[PDB]
Amino acid sequence: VSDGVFETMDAAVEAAALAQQQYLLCSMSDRARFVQGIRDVILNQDTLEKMSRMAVEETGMGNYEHKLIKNRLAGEKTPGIEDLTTDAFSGDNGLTLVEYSPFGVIGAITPTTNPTETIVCNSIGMLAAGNSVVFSPHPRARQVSLLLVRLINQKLAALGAPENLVVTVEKPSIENTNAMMAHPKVRMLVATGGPAIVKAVLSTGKKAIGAGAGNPPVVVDETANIEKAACDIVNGCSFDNNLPXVAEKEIIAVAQIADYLIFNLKKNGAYEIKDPAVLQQLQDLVLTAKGGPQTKCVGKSAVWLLSQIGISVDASIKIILMEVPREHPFVQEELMMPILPLVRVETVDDAIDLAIEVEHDNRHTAIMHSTDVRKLTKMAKLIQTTIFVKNGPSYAGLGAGGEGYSTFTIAGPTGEGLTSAKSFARRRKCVMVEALNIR
Amino acid sequence: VSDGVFETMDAAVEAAALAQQQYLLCSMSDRARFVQGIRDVILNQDTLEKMSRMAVEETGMGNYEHKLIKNRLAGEKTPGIEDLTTDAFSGDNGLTLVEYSPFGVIGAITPTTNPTETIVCNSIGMLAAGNSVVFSPHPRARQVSLLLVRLINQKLAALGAPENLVVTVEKPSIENTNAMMAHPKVRMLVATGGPAIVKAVLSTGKKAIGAGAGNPPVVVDETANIEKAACDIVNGCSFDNNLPXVAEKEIIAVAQIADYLIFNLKKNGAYEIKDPAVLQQLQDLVLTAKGGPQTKCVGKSAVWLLSQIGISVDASIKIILMEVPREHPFVQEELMMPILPLVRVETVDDAIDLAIEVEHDNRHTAIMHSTDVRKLTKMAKLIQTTIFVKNGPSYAGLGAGGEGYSTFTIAGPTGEGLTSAKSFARRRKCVMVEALNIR
Amino acid sequence: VSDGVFETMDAAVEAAALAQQQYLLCSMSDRARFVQGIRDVILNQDTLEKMSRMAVEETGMGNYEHKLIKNRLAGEKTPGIEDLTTDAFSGDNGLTLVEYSPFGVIGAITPTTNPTETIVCNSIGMLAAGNSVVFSPHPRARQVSLLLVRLINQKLAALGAPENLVVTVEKPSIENTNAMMAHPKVRMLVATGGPAIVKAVLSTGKKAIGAGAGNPPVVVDETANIEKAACDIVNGCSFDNNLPXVAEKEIIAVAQIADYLIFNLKKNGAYEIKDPAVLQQLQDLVLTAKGGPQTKCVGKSAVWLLSQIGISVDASIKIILMEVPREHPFVQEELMMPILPLVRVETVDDAIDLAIEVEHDNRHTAIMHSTDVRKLTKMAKLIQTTIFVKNGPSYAGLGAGGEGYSTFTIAGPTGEGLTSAKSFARRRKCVMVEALNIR
Amino acid sequence: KSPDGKSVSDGVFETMDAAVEAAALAQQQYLLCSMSDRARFVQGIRDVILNQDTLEKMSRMAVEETGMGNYEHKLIKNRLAGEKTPGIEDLTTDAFSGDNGLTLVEYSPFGVIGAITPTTNPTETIVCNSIGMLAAGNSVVFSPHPRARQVSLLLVRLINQKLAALGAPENLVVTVEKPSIENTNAMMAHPKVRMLVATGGPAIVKAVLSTGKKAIGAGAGNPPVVVDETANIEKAACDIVNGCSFDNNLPXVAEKEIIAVAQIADYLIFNLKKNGAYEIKDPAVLQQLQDLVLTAKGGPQTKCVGKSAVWLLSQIGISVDASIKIILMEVPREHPFVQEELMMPILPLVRVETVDDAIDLAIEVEHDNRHTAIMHSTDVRKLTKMAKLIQTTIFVKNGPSYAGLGAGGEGYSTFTIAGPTGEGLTSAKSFARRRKCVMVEALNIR
Ligand SMILES: CCC(=O)SCCNC(=O)CCNC(=O)[C@H](O)C(C)(C)COP(=O)(O)OP(=O)(O)OC[C@H]1O[C@@H](n2cnc3c(N)ncnc32)[C@H](O)[C@@H]1OP(=O)(O)O
Ligand SMILES: CC(C)(COP(=O)(O)OP(=O)(O)OC[C@H]1O[C@@H](n2cnc3c(N)ncnc32)[C@H](O)[C@@H]1OP(=O)(O)O)[C@@H](O)C(=O)NCCC(=O)NCCS
Ligand SMILES: CC(C)(COP(=O)(O)OP(=O)(O)OC[C@H]1O[C@@H](n2cnc3c(N)ncnc32)[C@H](O)[C@@H]1OP(=O)(O)O)[C@@H](O)C(=O)NCCC(=O)NCCS
Ligand SMILES: CC(C)(COP(=O)(O)OP(=O)(O)OC[C@H]1O[C@@H](n2cnc3c(N)ncnc32)[C@H](O)[C@@H]1OP(=O)(O)O)[C@@H](O)C(=O)NCCC(=O)NCCS
Q1: Span of the secretion signal (chain D) (predicted)?
Q2: I need a labelling partner for C278 at 20 to 30 A (CA). Which of A22, C231, D86, D400 fits?
Q3: In testing the pocket of ligand 2, which one of A110, A116, A138 has its CB within 8 Å of the most ligand atoms?
């Protein structure tokens, strides 16, 4: 029985192409069993712990406790076949049905920051829609990704699925990703990664979903529950060491509440840097010569980052907080580290304007703490982000403490929003002329 | 006041970019007024006839009568702002709203087969979704396209719209089209045209919706209403001289009813060619040396085509019919001419199998005449086309005699189906954590 | 042709029963034409003004300018056949369709407060769903109701409807109403009226929709836009002289803003009574010996009510306002007069508790002015009213300045909410076993 | 023209007044519970009936106490109620946003619901009603039939035990120690009952609609199954025998007369007998069965309702093995077996000339119940015509009638099928009041 891992990308694609042809003969009940199997794989406590620990050990990024939550979020709240609704319209001209049907072979690029969550979430959605999926995982997460694919293949084999619904290559690489993106039998590309790989998949001549960059501002105005806001912001920013695409990456605080907010942030585990010499040491540690984030620091804990500049703090410290001007690189750059700059502004309207500016027209994610329905509406409407979270941590936008389903492929540039099974399906219209209008 | 036509593509794109920024400040009521304005433009009887006549004259393709119908179909049954529905979910974690918001500037490539219908349909959908649109019309439809753009800009100015919501260039060209595709301020590309241009917009690094090619088979089995089938098939095949992407392009008839079908086809205006020499004359006329359709004959009437091989017939002749083997170029090629080959097969199951084969995995459009719900289901399910029409003319798939809305941008490889305003919008999720859950 | 007005209730019902049998043979396109026909009847400006003036002059209740708005609201925002959506579910077991189909003959009881609005709203919804309707109008609004029915029948005759889709009797009476309730061919009763007649239609052994009483509190807390709240409250309370079921009938104001609210209410046309002797005069005028509203005062203007106690004011006076304890009859009673008591409370939580109490478990309508999303949510969730309006006049709950459709039959005990065509339809399920599953 | 077709309180109270008062207090407390709480309680009810020992006990006990139905099929129907009754996911939200802000439409509780349950589906209805009503945030007072007293009270106690272990307010689901029609009348009259739900015959439906309260009435049917010449006749015979004999013809949807186009009627009958139909051709034997199963007034004998074909045949001296599932007879349309809703595995066949005649006759013998009808036909035009004209709450094409209840057809299940009051297949939504929340000029974030 195939374990889904192939020596060459071309062999993987051919196998997934044959698999998806056979898959088309399977029932929706079969699909639901396979979907549940993937859930059972990642939600099995032993595998859940193994995937969460292994990703941290292999990538050096994130933390075990939060990957437990994120992997479980992927397993529990990714939509299954119930996502594939049917539209119907009946009248004098008969019945029209609109269905979500498979693309075929989907090629999926997955990140090193959420390797297992994206595989679980992509796999469930793509197989629910009747596709097979070829994964090109990031080489930095090769071992955990290949093991997850093999575990999924083992489970699907036990469930009587066609072999090779979920496949990858023995040696993930840029070149194998290139081969996947260029293979004629790949019908759609899905890229969860940085803007480079997204531009690439959108340059292949193929249908592509691209999950893009963010720089999420969190605005706090004078009407917010400041004590809850501080707790939410620390939790959101430090969740998996700031790896989630939605995670807070700069605070924009109205002046009249900024000090009390800072006070409560420190109460909730923020380590405040005031010494500009200490701040400069941190900028030297976490920024490249080009001014971008140091990969060696991405997804490291606040404790670890502080230890690297000679500062020893206990486990209660969750973020590194500093009040800085808006031009500071911690504000402008998407660090993907639990380093959270705060910019003080005079009014909520200034805060909204600055949040739009620093979000850089990524239109990805933004957060606001405010009880004023008018200011919540104004910021949400103006900033036009794929995800907008009000009065909660950023991960409420992923279904953790907010209503809705979860995803780990959030599509901004291509506009799909929170991808689910429907996103991996072709919309088909079936017209029964002058029949089946039984009203 | 700008008329919407610019000397350079870069000027058109920059003007649309400013226009859309201003458009974001307009109400949904404003959008509805602008949508209605575009409907009023094309549905105005004088403009309706002028657009239909000018398109036929300038392109040499289609017929005036059917372009009246198609332009009216675009003006009347293209969804407006009511397409932009809202999803809501409420519970213990509060309320989550999901909305359709604008992309920004959309670059739209329009074909010379449906120049005005596509402009009307794209404009309504894209403006309804809060976008501006830059059109790159086909050079062979330059004059009618630019006049429509001018008339739209005139109407929108009278309605108080931002200037330059709908723009184009003075000199349409493949060079200007490539310039639009490369322009950084174009946020999404929409290509209604051949596979080459669709592959191109999908190779730009941008979100792109691409139309697809088809080769629509119409299967007729022994349970069909043969008299109605023959009428539907002639009407559908000869609609705008076989220009529509959905139009029937080969008949696959169960042998037991083929002769009765052919008899009724002839009664409905089919000119049957049985002389293999006359057939060869037709092939030499309508096929290039490479075997593809001759541009000079695309969209020409059956009367005109027969006259070019010296056969004079009255206006009651709508299609040219011939019984040929499946390998014949008229079967294999997407002629876009009212030339309709018929292949005879033993059983409905063979008809379904052959229909799948000759559709060439375009998964675009197929048609079936049959009253057997099992065979209707089998063919529709297996052939997996974006549009499937049962017991009607192909154009029932576009809302003309079938339930649903109309479009003239039917997505091919990108899977949106019949594009509408929704297709030109980004999906946005707004999460009100632990509030607005008022159940 | 029949003008739809019959000498006996039995003849009206028999005619409507035959009409609906014939109506079943009409298309959805026919239904849509008839719906548009009724809209055209009431939306014709000259007819709109005639109906509005005639109702006020015949009943003595309401005012002309606002009946213009309400009749237009009924004609413009009552859902048509688009309300009758189709649900579909497809899978291994085939296709299931769920449709909204006619009840048959519906007997509709209409009020003297909104005679023409209810006839328009009921007629459009009931005919859209494929029913016929027998109206039993209130005797006080006899002639305006019969004139509307005759105009509908004339319009429908011209549009080619079966005669007698909409019928009534020449002499409305409680006896004819009882005969409608008792008639075996009436398949559903709809009662828009006071609780006695609603209890009656729910005691007939028939499916019945019943209106409810209300006593709508409007809460204003310290976060509200007080200037806007004052304007909204005056407009909502005095709308058609407080006849609408949704209209504000007591203010519960948080002490922090109560005086400034009263100040702004007076600037918007509130006449404030502080003299307890004058207040006692008003109570003597508007209350019966048993403490309920005087019918002779229901729907009278504030100008008229003040003149009846010897106070002469100009037309800028829209409501009579008094700060009183919660036990005051004007708070406790649904006056249906532009008399608006204000009760002052310590906190928004006290305001919510009191609003729930004085709403008397009608669960009909409540209104809140507050910008705190938490307090808006708390009150909306706790008071459990069929309509809840936030930061607007009460009539925004009927589609006048709020999103959604309008109705003038807001169900009370029967739970349908804002009745529309769906409410007048039977839900039917059509199961195509193992076919038409074409995904 | 093919002649072969085409191949701690336990929830049980001394008086109705006490039960209603307890459920009213319970529902006030329930309003403070979260949707997560409701979901736990819904799952608790599912766990009660789907527990294998309780599933078997409920199914066996209902048959033994009522004398109606059969154990194997009540296992299926009870499991169908537990598995496919919608939960809180039924309570969807509508939203509309624009220049005037945001409007939300929600499904909110009625309060105390009084539910009358039948002796033909006593546990399935309790399970199905309980799940839907609690999902929507109501409490429910059950008034079961005296003939199903013991099994109904046990189920209520088991539900109360489970909900107590899950931390629910006491008495979300209640009933009375002594079920009686008089207690049903008392429940219908109680001021604190906000809605009545009646799963029963036409008299009880009329009664709940005569109370001054909102009532959902799930009425009678007489479901015809039309078979035309385009049908898969072999499958139709199998489906018809299975649907008619399901729980001994107790389900409201079950086939109760065949209307067969003449050209396939004999081949259909041959296949019906192949699939377990015992055909009576002897008019003397047919008269014997009529004397057995019809009362002096001509209605069904309660002693025979829900009895097996085997048992019914034995009562007229005919011994057959357990492969016999229905008693089949070809008769004129006027025959009482056609006209009456027997709720017995007795299935008359009426032969007609054409499918259009079959449709006309099916409409006629369905008696404007507009409840359930079934058609076997592959012709999309005749399927549409019959479905459109007969206007039934449930229409099943090319399957057994119980495919209309989510068993072999798409959709959810219910055991309260509302024709007269029009709710259709009742679910949690049906037990909720629609509420509209209008946020004027805010929360329009498009
Ligand atoms: C938001 C938009 C909306 O407001 S929705 C529209 C719903 N409007 C209402 O329900 C208004 C409630 N009606 C009332 O309060 C009263 O009718 C008011 C306005 C005080 C008028 O007084 P009055 O003339 O005495 O009418 P009434 O209903 O109180 O009773 C008078 C007798 O007439 C009867 N009646 C009632 N409706 C009908 C009818 N359609 N046809 C024949 N008779 C009717 C009543 O039963 C009553 O007779 P009886 O004394 O009960 O025997
Ligand atoms: C991935 C990360 C370690 C970047 O560090 P890095 O040193 O630049 O390493 P990269 O692998 O990304 O860069 C080398 C190439 O590998 C490409 N690449 C990204 N994912 C890849 C994948 N699954 N397979 C093959 N190549 C991949 C990158 O596009 C990049 O191309 P480039 O050299 O042209 O820029 C991390 O810091 C990061 O930026 N993650 C963002 C990705 C993301 O947004 N994921 C969304 C999670 S929901
Ligand atoms: C276009 C047509 C009338 C004539 O074919 P033709 O002689 O090759 O004419 P064209 O060369 O201009 O056809 C498209 C060509 O111009 C380009 N082109 C297409 N649309 C263009 C546009 N709006 N602007 C600029 N260039 C365009 C294409 O890149 C292609 O280039 P190519 O000649 O190198 O292949 C006919 O072949 C046709 O319409 N085919 C199908 C197109 C279609 O799918 N229409 C569906 C509309 S709903
Ligand atoms: C089996 C049955 C037919 C017994 O018939 P019966 O012996 O002649 O009459 P009953 O024993 O029911 O008692 C007579 C009255 O009790 C009433 N009744 C029915 N169910 C009742 C209940 N749960 N509680 C109190 N009274 C009830 C009815 O008014 C019935 O009137 P009826 O004789 O006109 O039918 C009957 O009890 C029954 O439940 N039928 C099911 C009808 C139905 O549509 N059920 C829906 C199943 S999902």
Answers
A1: none
A2: C231
A3: A138
